[PDB]
Design a protein around this ligand. Structure first.
Ligand SMILES: Nc1nc2c(ncn2[C@@H]2O[C@H](COP(=O)(O)OP(=O)(O)OP(=O)(O)O)[C@@H](O)[C@H]2O)c(=O)[nH]1
Ligand SMILES: Nc1nc2c(ncn2[C@@H]2O[C@H](COP(=O)(O)OP(=O)(O)OP(=O)(O)O)[C@@H](O)[C@H]2O)c(=O)[nH]1
Ligand SMILES: COc1ccc(CNc2c(-c3ccccc3O)nc3ccc(F)cn23)cc1
Ligand SMILES: [Ca+2]
Ligand SMILES: [Mg+2]
Ligand SMILES: [Mg+2]
Lengths: 67, 440, 421
């Protein structure tokens, strides 16, 4: 009975720790997946805008080199 | 000890904290500046009201609470309002930019900038506590801060405070006062990510409260001030078991043992009576039988559903004021023979009763009548799943076309989260159906 | 989130800009030197959204006045509230644009653009918390059409997480009869679809027709059209400018009104041009639309409604429910609760009760088709391309611009045909 009494409290601690653990890890997982996603969205937006600057360079070099 | 820390998130959370804390101050005779004449023990004490209020050496009684919002306008009105002296400036926390009705910004983008500061301040209150019982989290389902910051906070609180109990008072969105088209998305995302971390959740349906204000208080077009004053009364009835001494006072956790038969089934339906205007309450004393009967009228409920077309798993009555057990028992006997109350076959059908002697109070210049007695029923009925269903249908209409989904994906979320959350609510709806099916 | 940075570009941009500032200054109790002679605290409470606070209690517009043609500087400065603008924020080029889009976007605007961007940064760095940018301009001319849309694209790179509004004035043969206006607009629209979060379609054909039929005027000036545009611009900024129980900013607008990033073209409406049911019926009426479309030839994805004046809030609720009930087919069923309503107590100067309407309707494709048709009549016989191919442009860029706007129309049509089941 005493050894069983220690197994039960050890289990209660184990599972409480497990919840705290997997919540901690699940959270860090999401925050890191999110930051990579948000940054990937903004990186693509800026890379489409920098692709316009580089098309404006072609149109400004078609007036200067067609005269 | 048995201290309880309140956390008020976003506009709805904040403005309901005002209503609540204004009300608690009147309930305990605490003046605006924080002084309490009737408290002879200066600097501290063990009294029942100390579960919600710490004392300073100067005699100031200070709410065990934290207001958090990602923009300053709502909290600035607490900083300059009637009760500005009640709160330590570090309890009132703001950012510069809001979540903009977007769960994602509240949870990730704007939210992670202020979250360590919020936990740091929650920690400072937690260390004034000799035996902390748990948190009470006030927030809207529909807001960006209310939905996404709360979810982040709840997750983080489960890490810092383990299994320490967490109660939610959640504002459920209604078209009469709704501010955003995307509220159903925010609602289903917060509900999903909060469900493992909350121990009990009292939903308040803005429509239900809106209807009660029009019908019972004769208010033509209720504002938030009108709704919060009614809500604070309900909140007060529920927390009154924590804040008052009493021979017949059953503690709120004891009700929770009865209210939550499985971890996911933790959404009690509340119903409050009497809500009546002064005009109508004059020469009209409402007995224990009348207010008890009013608890089973579904127009008095906090969530629009029909318990009559569902099954009960528990029924708690929290009376306050001039009430004695005899009258309560007679009243319950009458109701059992004359009303539609069917329990599931695995619950005992006894109603659990608690009584506080302190009668309810009213905020000066309000619409409620001061009454000698009052009652809040907390039931666990399968009917409340109706509320999930309505909201889940609105979510499905938009999600099928991907309306607005780009605003969430741009702030970093994936489509996976949306469908993962919706399937969790699909399962939850299926759980509330299963518990009602009879055994074999 | 407080501060907005306004940018008025070209002639149309600067004249509707000046009217806008005249009206809201009047509504906030600001005079030409820039003092506060008001009475009500609500006028000052969120003045920060459009104004800076200098020494001597002097409130100063956060405006950036831009044109390739000077004299538009002189007229703006000789105008009623010309003294109030900040002297260094006038950024006026040399030789003008002469109704060419490639000059605005690629060559001549390309030089001036950096000295605008300096005024933008100076204004943006003194923002506690900047929400975004509104650009008043037209899509028919050269500067506002082309420089306006390069500014958009350049502001986007330095502030990609801030909102980009436009009050985009759409061109019509009844007001101006310049021949290449359908080119300039279609090139602009190909930029707007990609780089703005929300564009109000103020449309010259609708404004002409209102001035003519409603207001009685037999041939109206620009000043007559702009009396309308200023009234609209006053109304769709009421929720930004005054407090209210609602808190209202440019992102919250965008999130709630724009269900798909490309469908960000709003049809505004104002009423009158009097009681609450009549107001409510007038604002959903095709005669009161500042774009030249019919609500009843498509479906509303989303609607914001703004009522100003002392009125029963109960009456307004019942009426807004009324028109939704009686006109249920003209809102899409797969977006619930897609019509919202605010009320400001304070009405505009002149009227005791106004009602302003912002609608994202799929019937806005009637505007993009009328433009598309005037464009396609010209382009398919290469008319006037030496104006554009001379400043360096390809022919490809016309085909893409035409195709992009036909996709926008096709997509507006897809969600009009969509069904809940
Ligand atoms: N009952 C009640 N509901 C409120 C109150 N204020 C807002 N709401 C409701 O709450 C929902 C909107 O969420 P808010 O709490 O305003 O939003 P928020 O959490 O501040 O989030 P953001 O403002 O988007 O960052 C809507 O359903 C409103 O009707 C209030 O004082 N009382
Ligand atoms: N509603 C309205 N439309 C205007 C006004 N002024 C000009 N427009 C319209 O503007 C269009 C032409 O663009 P403008 O703004 O004049 O030209 P710009 O963009 O400044 O280009 P440049 O003059 O080529 O430098 C035409 O469709 C005009 O009818 C005005 O005050 N109100
Ligand atoms: C489904 O429609 C919407 C939902 C939220 C918002 C954001 N705020 C806003 C606005 C609004 C915001 C910015 C600029 C001008 C404006 O007029 N006007 C309303 C009217 C009612 C209301 F509830 C909110 N409003 C807009 C539309
Ligand atoms: Ca004490
Ligand atoms: Mg808010
Ligand atoms: Mg010009």
């Amino acid at each position: 009975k005493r050894e069983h009494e220690r197994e039960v409290i050890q289990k209660a601690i184990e599972e409480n720790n497990n919840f705290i653990k997997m919540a901690k890890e699940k959270l860090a997982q999401k925050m890191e997946s999110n930051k990579e996603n948000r940054e990937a969205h903004l990186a693509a937006m800026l890379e489409r805008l920098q692709e316009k600057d580089k098309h404006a360079e072609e149109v400004r070099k078609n007036k200067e080199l067609k005269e | 000890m048995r201290e309880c820390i309140s956390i008020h998130v976003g506009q709805a959370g904040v403005q309901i904290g005002n209503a609540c804390w204004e009300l608690y101050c009147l309930e305990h005779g605490i003046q605006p500046d924080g002084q309490m004449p009737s408290d002879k023990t200066i600097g501290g004490g063990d009294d029942s009201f100390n579960t919600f209020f710490s004392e300073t050496g100067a005699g100031k009684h200070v709410p065990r609470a934290v207001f958090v919002d990602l923009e300053p306008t709502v909290i600035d009105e607490v900083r300059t309002g009637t009760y500005r002296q009640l709160f330590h400036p570090e309890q009132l926390i703001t950012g510069k930019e809001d979540a903009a009705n977007n769960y994602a910004r509240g949870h990730y983008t704007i939210g992670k900038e202020i979250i360590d500061l919020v936990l740091d301040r929650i920690r400072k209150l937690a260390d004034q506590c000799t035996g902390l019982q748990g948190f009470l989290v006030f927030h809207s389902f529909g807001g960006g801060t209310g939905s996404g910051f709360t979810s982040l906070l709840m997750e983080r609180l489960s890490v810092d405070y383990g299994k320490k109990s967490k109660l939610e008072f959640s504002i459920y969105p209604a078209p009469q006062v709704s501010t955003a088209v995307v509220e159903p998305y925010n609602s289903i995302l917060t509900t999903h990510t909060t469900l493992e971390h909350s121990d009990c959740a009292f939903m308040v349906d803005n429509e239900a409260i809106y209807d009660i204000c029009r019908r019972n208080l004769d208010i033509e077009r209720p504002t938030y001030t009108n709704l919060n004053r009614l809500i604070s009364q309900i909140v007060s009835s529920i927390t009154a078991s924590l804040r008052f001494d009493g021979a017949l006072n059953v503690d709120l956790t004891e009700f929770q043992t009865n209210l939550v038969p499985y971890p996911r089934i933790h959404f009690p339906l509340a119903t409050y009576a009497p809500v009546i205007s002064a005009e109508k309450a004059y020469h009209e004393q409402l007995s224990v039988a009348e207010i008890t009967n009013a608890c089973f009228e579904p127009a008095n409920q906090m969530v629009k559903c029909d318990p009559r077309h569902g099954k009960y798993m528990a029924c708690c009555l929290l009376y306050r004021g001039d009430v004695v057990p005899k009258d309560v028992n007679a009243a319950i006997a009458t109701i059992k023979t004359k009303r539609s109350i069917q329990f599931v076959d695995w619950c005992p059908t006894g109603f659990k009763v608690g009584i506080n002697y302190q009668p309810p109070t009213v905020v000066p210049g309000g619409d409620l009548a001061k009454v000698q007695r009052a009652v809040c029923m907390l039931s666990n009925t399968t009917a409340i799943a109706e509320a999930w269903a309505r909201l889940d249908h609105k979510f499905d209409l938009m999600y099928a076309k991907r309306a607005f989904v780009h605003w969430y994906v741009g702030e970093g979320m994936e489509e996976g989260e949306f469908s993962e959350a919706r399937e969790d609510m699909a399962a939850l709806e299926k759980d509330y159906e299963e518990v009602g099916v009879d055994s074999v | 989130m407080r501060e907005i940075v306004h940018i008025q570009a070209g002639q149309c941009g600067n004249q509707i800009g000046a009217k806008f500032w005249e009206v809201i200054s009047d509504e906030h109790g600001i005079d030409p030197t820039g003092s506060y002679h008001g009475d009500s605290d609500l006028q000052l409470e969120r003045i920060n959204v459009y104004y800076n606070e200098a020494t001597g209690n002097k409130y100063v517009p956060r405006a950036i006045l831009v044109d390739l043609e000077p004299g538009t500087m002189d007229s703006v400065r000789s105008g009623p509230f010309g003294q109030i603008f900040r002297p260094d924020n006038f950024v006026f080029g040399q030789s003008g644009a002469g109704n060419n889009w490639a000059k605005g976007h690629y060559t001549e605007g390309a030089e001036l653009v950096d000295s605008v961007l300096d005024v933008v940064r100076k204004e943006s760095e003194s923002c506690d918390c900047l929400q975004g940018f509104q650009l008043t301009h037209s899509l028919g001319g050269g500067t506002g059409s082309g420089m306006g849309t390069l500014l958009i694209s350049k502001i986007r790179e330095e502030y990609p997480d801030r909102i980009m509004n436009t009050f985009s004035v759409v061109p019509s043969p009844k007001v101006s009869d310049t021949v290449v206006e359908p080119y300039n607009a279609t090139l602009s629209v190909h930029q707007l679809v990609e780089n703005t979060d929300e564009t109000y379609c103020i449309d010259n054909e609708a404004l002409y027709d209102i001035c003519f039929r409603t207001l009685k005027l037999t041939t109206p000036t620009y000043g007559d059209l702009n009396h309308l545009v200023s009234a609209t611009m006053s109304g769709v900024t009421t929720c930004l400018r005054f407090p209210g129980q609602l808190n209202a900013d440019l992102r919250k607008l965008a999130v709630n009104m724009v269900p798909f990033p490309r469908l960000h073209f709003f049809m505004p409406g104002f009423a009158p041009l009097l009681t609450v049911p009549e107001l409510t019926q007038q604002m959903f009426d095709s005669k009161n639309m500042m774009a030249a479309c019919d609500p009843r030839h498509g479906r509303y994805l989303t609607v914001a409604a703004v009522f100003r004046g002392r009125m029963s809030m109960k009456e307004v609720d019942e009426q807004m429910l009324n028109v939704q009930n009686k006109n249920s087919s003209y809102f899409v069923e797969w977006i619930p609760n897609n019509v919202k309503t605010a009320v400001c107590d304070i009405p505009p100067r002149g009227l005791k009760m106004s009602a302003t309407f912002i609608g994202n309707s799929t019937a806005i494709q009637e505007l993009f088709k009328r433009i598309s048709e005037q464009f396609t009549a010209m382009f398919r016989r290469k008319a006037f391309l030496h104006w554009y191919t001379g400043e360096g442009m390809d022919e490809m860029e016309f085909t893409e611009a035409e195709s992009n706007m036909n996709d926008l129309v096709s997509e507006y049509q897809q969600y009009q045909d969509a069904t809940a089941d």
